[PDB]
Enzyme design. Structure first.
Site, short mmCIF file in Angstrom:
data_model
loop_
_atom_site.label_atom_id
_atom_site.label_comp_id
_atom_site.label_asym_id
_atom_site.label_seq_id
_atom_site.Cartn_x
_atom_site.Cartn_y
_atom_site.Cartn_z
N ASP A 186 0.82 -1.20 0.00
CA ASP A 186 0.00 0.00 0.00
C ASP A 186 0.86 1.26 0.00
O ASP A 186 1.89 1.33 0.68
CB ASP A 186 -0.90 0.02 1.23
CG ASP A 186 -1.80 -1.23 1.32
OD1 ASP A 186 -1.44 -2.25 0.73
OD2 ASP A 186 -2.79 -1.15 1.99
N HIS B 125 -1.33 4.46 -0.45
CA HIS B 125 -2.42 5.29 0.08
C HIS B 125 -2.07 6.78 0.03
O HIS B 125 -2.14 7.51 1.01
CB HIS B 125 -2.79 4.86 1.51
CG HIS B 125 -3.67 3.65 1.55
ND1 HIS B 125 -3.26 2.45 2.09
CD2 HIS B 125 -4.93 3.45 1.10
CE1 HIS B 125 -4.23 1.56 1.95
NE2 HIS B 125 -5.26 2.15 1.37
N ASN C 172 -8.42 -2.91 -2.96
CA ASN C 172 -9.82 -2.65 -2.64
C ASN C 172 -10.16 -1.16 -2.63
O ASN C 172 -11.35 -0.80 -2.69
CB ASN C 172 -10.20 -3.32 -1.29
CG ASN C 172 -9.32 -2.86 -0.14
OD1 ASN C 172 -8.11 -2.92 -0.24
ND2 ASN C 172 -9.92 -2.43 0.95
N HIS C 173 -9.18 -0.29 -2.58
CA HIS C 173 -9.47 1.13 -2.62
C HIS C 173 -9.53 1.69 -4.04
O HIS C 173 -9.91 2.86 -4.22
CB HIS C 173 -8.44 1.90 -1.79
CG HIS C 173 -8.66 1.80 -0.32
ND1 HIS C 173 -9.36 2.77 0.38
CD2 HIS C 173 -8.35 0.84 0.56
CE1 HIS C 173 -9.42 2.41 1.65
NE2 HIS C 173 -8.81 1.25 1.78
N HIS D 6 -3.76 -8.03 -3.86
CA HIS D 6 -3.77 -7.07 -2.76
C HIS D 6 -4.13 -7.75 -1.44
O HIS D 6 -3.37 -7.66 -0.46
CB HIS D 6 -4.76 -5.95 -3.01
CG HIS D 6 -4.87 -4.99 -1.85
ND1 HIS D 6 -3.90 -4.05 -1.59
CD2 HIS D 6 -5.80 -4.85 -0.86
CE1 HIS D 6 -4.24 -3.36 -0.51
NE2 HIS D 6 -5.36 -3.86 -0.01
N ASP E 170 -6.83 7.19 -1.44
CA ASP E 170 -7.52 7.23 -0.16
C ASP E 170 -6.60 7.36 1.04
O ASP E 170 -5.47 6.87 1.02
CB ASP E 170 -8.42 5.97 0.04
CG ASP E 170 -9.62 5.95 -0.85
OD1 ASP E 170 -9.99 7.04 -1.35
OD2 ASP E 170 -10.22 4.83 -1.04
N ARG E 171 -7.09 8.04 2.08
CA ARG E 171 -6.49 8.09 3.41
C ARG E 171 -5.33 9.07 3.44
O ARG E 171 -5.26 9.90 4.35
CB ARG E 171 -6.06 6.70 3.86
CG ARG E 171 -7.26 5.68 3.99
CD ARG E 171 -7.36 5.07 5.41
NE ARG E 171 -8.53 4.22 5.58
CZ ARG E 171 -8.56 2.90 5.37
NH1 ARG E 171 -7.47 2.23 4.97
NH2 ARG E 171 -9.68 2.23 5.55
N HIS F 246 -2.35 -4.94 1.99
CA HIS F 246 -3.66 -4.76 2.58
C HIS F 246 -3.62 -4.56 4.08
O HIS F 246 -4.56 -4.02 4.66
CB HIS F 246 -4.54 -6.00 2.22
CG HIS F 246 -6.02 -5.80 2.41
ND1 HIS F 246 -6.62 -4.57 2.33
CD2 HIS F 246 -7.01 -6.68 2.71
CE1 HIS F 246 -7.92 -4.69 2.51
NE2 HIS F 246 -8.19 -5.96 2.75
N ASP G 82 -4.04 -0.16 -3.72
CA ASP G 82 -4.31 0.85 -2.71
C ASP G 82 -3.38 2.06 -2.87
O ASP G 82 -2.61 2.39 -1.98
CB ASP G 82 -4.19 0.24 -1.30
CG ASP G 82 -5.47 -0.49 -0.86
OD1 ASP G 82 -6.38 -0.60 -1.69
OD2 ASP G 82 -5.48 -0.84 0.29
N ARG H 102 -13.21 -6.84 9.14
CA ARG H 102 -13.70 -5.74 8.32
C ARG H 102 -15.20 -5.83 8.01
O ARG H 102 -15.79 -4.85 7.55
CB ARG H 102 -12.94 -5.69 7.00
CG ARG H 102 -11.40 -5.60 7.14
CD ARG H 102 -10.75 -5.91 5.81
NE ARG H 102 -9.33 -6.19 5.90
CZ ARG H 102 -8.39 -5.26 5.88
NH1 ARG H 102 -8.72 -3.98 5.75
NH2 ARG H 102 -7.10 -5.61 5.97
MN LIG Z 1 -6.44 -2.72 1.21
MN LIG Z 2 -4.87 -0.71 2.57
#
Ligand SMILES: [Mn+2]
Ligand SMILES: [Mn+2]
Length: 348
Positions: free
Chosen positions: A58, A60, A118-119, A167, A89-90, A242, A86, A215
């Site tokens: 990741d 991010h 997944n993002h 991922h 995001d964030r 992840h 990923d 999750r």
């Molecule tokens: Mn992820």
């Molecule tokens: Mn992540």
């Protein structure tokens, strides 16, 4: 596309104060998305790569940590790269992060690879920062152009027929690699099933087989699931991301699975290092890591804490967003005819 101009501008902020933006035009980012999307579609959804290769987890949107990672590992094409997803995001600079990554994908399509995390899906990055970044600096139309590009990302990669990469992790529905290959793009990421699990699942030493994922999405899988998977498909290693891990890399199941996480001091909420994994011609694995204060190096010290606007959502706001996601996915988001069943709609 003025690709070399685009890249030079993205790299010029090296040595500037982390956070400073790269000013690409709407059409330059629109260009990056459309050309990278064409390349992703021209390549397999299940990538088949060869070492030597460096692999990252990741990022991010921590753009300046990505620059420092390349400074440490080598800027393309000095090294070959696989990223495990990923990208947005964030973090605060998802746009510069993805734009550089897509530009390097257009620049070196055979030596630079991005998997889908997944993002990289509309329902998730609508909430967790990316959509907000596009609206703020550009417009909603651009967020939808990225969505089209993300919907075409490959989902997994096998390196030298021995290291399986994605991922998240394995799926109870993953019986044959052909199940991944038959997935048609553009596609959304469903709320369950193989494509969901590939981007969402996690290992767990406490699980013998499959378990509940904290999750509320997909499952956990145990070491025996890893071993039986590797034996069935004659693989030696699973490489995934992840999950934040203390040193940026963490082994599992007798070193048959490794977690890579490349964003140090993730979101300014963990004391973790970011790691890249090097796989050489002889399939030997080794690591380089950026630590906050196996080769070590100090990570850049800047404020990675970011605003989490999703925590402030009201039930009314959530409803409105679900209505927006549903309309967008129903009337605008391009989905391959054979993949509409995977389109993740939300309850009204
Ligand atoms: Mn992820
Ligand atoms: Mn992540």
């Amino acid at each position: 596309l003025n690709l070399d101009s685009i890249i030079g501008r993205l790299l010029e902020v090296q040595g500037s104060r982390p956070g400073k933006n790269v000013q690409l035009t709407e059409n330059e980012i629109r260009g990056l998305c459309l050309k990278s999307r064409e390349i992703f579609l021209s390549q397999p959804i299940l990538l088949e790569l060869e070492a030597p290769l460096k692999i990252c987890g990741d990022i991010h949107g921590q753009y300046y940590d990505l620059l420092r990672l390349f400074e440490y590992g080598g800027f393309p094409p000095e090294s070959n790269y696989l990223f495990l997803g990923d990208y947005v995001d964030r973090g605060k600079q998802s746009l510069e992060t993805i734009c550089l990554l897509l530009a390097y994908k257009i620049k070196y399509p055979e030596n630079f690879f991005l998997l889908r995390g997944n993002h990289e899906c509309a329902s998730i990055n609508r909430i967790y920062g990316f959509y907000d970044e596009c609206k703020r600096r550009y417009n909603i139309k651009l967020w939808k152009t990225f969505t089209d590009c993300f919907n075409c990302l490959p989902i997994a990669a096998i390196v030298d027929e021995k290291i399986f990469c994605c991922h998240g992790g394995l799926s109870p529905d993953l019986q044959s690699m052909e199940q991944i290959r038959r997935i048609m793009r553009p596609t959304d990421v469903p709320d369950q099933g193989l494509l969901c699990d590939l981007l969402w699942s996690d290992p767990d030493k406490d699980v013998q087989g499959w378990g509940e994922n904290d999750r509320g999405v997909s499952f956990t899988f145990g070491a025996e699931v890893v071993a039986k998977f590797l034996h069935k498909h004659d693989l030696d290693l699973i490489c995934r991301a992840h999950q934040v891990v203390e040193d940026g890399y963490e082994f599992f199941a007798k070193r048959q699975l490794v977690t890579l996480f490349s964003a140090p001091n993730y979101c300014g909420e963990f004391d973790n290092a970011g790691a890249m994994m090097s796989v050489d011609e002889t399939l030997m694995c080794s690591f380089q890591i950026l630590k906050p204060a196996v080769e070590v190096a100090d990570a850049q010290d800047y404020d990675r804490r970011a605003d989490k606007p999703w925590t402030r959502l009201t039930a009314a706001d959530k409803a409105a967003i679900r209505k927006e996601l549903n309309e967008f996915k129903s009337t605008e988001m391009e989905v391959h005819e054979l993949s509409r069943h995977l389109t993740r709609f939300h309850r009204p």
